[PDB]
């Protein structure tokens, strides 16, 4: 469960948020497997509930009504097409699997679902799946109002409803069973492996449990014997009776402390500066590195949904944004996960985003495809971060210095860091309000390098920076405080 599945070489994963199986399909062939991309973790697959107040947010599609592959994104013919279509290119499909519950308990009997099904939850009822009153925690809770009241209490933490959502009785071998039956038929169409949504709020044996009833990968596309790639998200940022390390039996875990303190060291907030990222990992008690799953953001906290807070950084924050992902990708630490987002109308009140519920680009409801433009940034009002030449560069910088020791590490005590990877890559970051110019040791060979965060390596030129390094290693890097992106990456394949 702790191998992602991914091709030989091929070191992160995208999440295309709110994507529509078609788009990503072409996405896979067209720009995901020629960058070196590993794979995608896509949105819910299951059908959910249709919210029309507020408007369709993203948040309809954590409320499932069944387990048919039903939804904005597509119907099941579409899923299908796409997992093959990016198998058969090297790039792998992960699952959000929610299975922890199904919708609100408050939301009306009817059929204003992604596909038409019918559910009650007041009764209980989802005859689609089907699940009645006997499958739920109802009777298992212990809390007053049946909801999570106080997460210092493990127990409510699993057996009440998370925010008003029904709570499924996974101790039960036939839920168990429904939910399996659910992930295998996508095991068996292709999917590599799954984020088991809200796994916090189950207990770490139920989830064994349902991963012992898994088959082993699609044999058409995967080696005998293969399992698929699990992360759990857990939000452990310590102060709480449940651990992620509880959760270490199952497969990874989401590593929510990463981008919470990566945000506020870059952001400089409270004393905090670069230079301290020299042991930067399981140092500042973070989980294991085989066991962790890291991101910058996430589409929970980048819209403040989930953990973070404040200090995490996003697409709105370009600049910062670009050189925290940059840290990321080229240090060893973790299973990197970039992220892709759409753009809303952020409208701050009282220190509140009021439209962090607007789910993504449409006409009338129907998701907006996402448009190429000729520079290859998208159109259509989807971000693509992915497609970021400082972002796309350091995903195949990843690939390019994997398995590359931590080595040759610089700071002068304030802002400006830099690092390399064996013999195969160095980079350099300069976060202090001035210029940066120096002479380091890179362990790189003899050369002239491309800096890939200015420009590319387009045979025989560099369409930006130049850095040479002299036979002993020696560079010289300047960096004003005042360029575009303050950082310079150079590595094996972007040499002259
Ligand atoms: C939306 C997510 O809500 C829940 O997350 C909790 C988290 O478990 C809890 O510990 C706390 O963390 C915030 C932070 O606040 C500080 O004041 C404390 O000092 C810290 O110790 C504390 O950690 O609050 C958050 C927010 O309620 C769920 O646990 C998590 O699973 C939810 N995210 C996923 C689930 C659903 C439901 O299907 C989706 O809506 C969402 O998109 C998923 O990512
Ligand atoms: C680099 O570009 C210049 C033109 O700007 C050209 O003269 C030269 O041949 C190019 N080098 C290679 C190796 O193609
Ligand atoms: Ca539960
Ligand atoms: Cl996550």
Redesign the pocket.
Known sequence: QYSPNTQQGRTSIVHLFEWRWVDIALECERYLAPKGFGGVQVSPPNENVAIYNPFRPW?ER??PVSYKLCTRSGNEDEFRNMVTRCNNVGVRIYVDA?I??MCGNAVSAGTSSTCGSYFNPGSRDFPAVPYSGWDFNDGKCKTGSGDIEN?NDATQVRDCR??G?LDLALEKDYVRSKIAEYMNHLIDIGVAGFRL?????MWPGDIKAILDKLHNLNSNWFPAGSKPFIYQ?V??????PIKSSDYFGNGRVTEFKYGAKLGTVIRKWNGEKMSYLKNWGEGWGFVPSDRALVFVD???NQRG???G?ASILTFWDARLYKMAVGFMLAHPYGFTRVMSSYRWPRQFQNGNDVNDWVGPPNNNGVIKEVTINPDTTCGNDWVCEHRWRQIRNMVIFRNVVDGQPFTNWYDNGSNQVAFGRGNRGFIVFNNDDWSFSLTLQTGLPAGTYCDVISGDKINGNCTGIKIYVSDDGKAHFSISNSAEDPFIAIHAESKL
């Not at 939000?235 to 709480?240: A, P, Q, R, S, T």
């Open positions: 948040w954590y409320q929610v922890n519950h997460y998370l925010t959502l949504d809200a796994s916090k709020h998200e939000i452990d940022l310590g102060g709480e996430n589409h929970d949904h989930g953990a807070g």
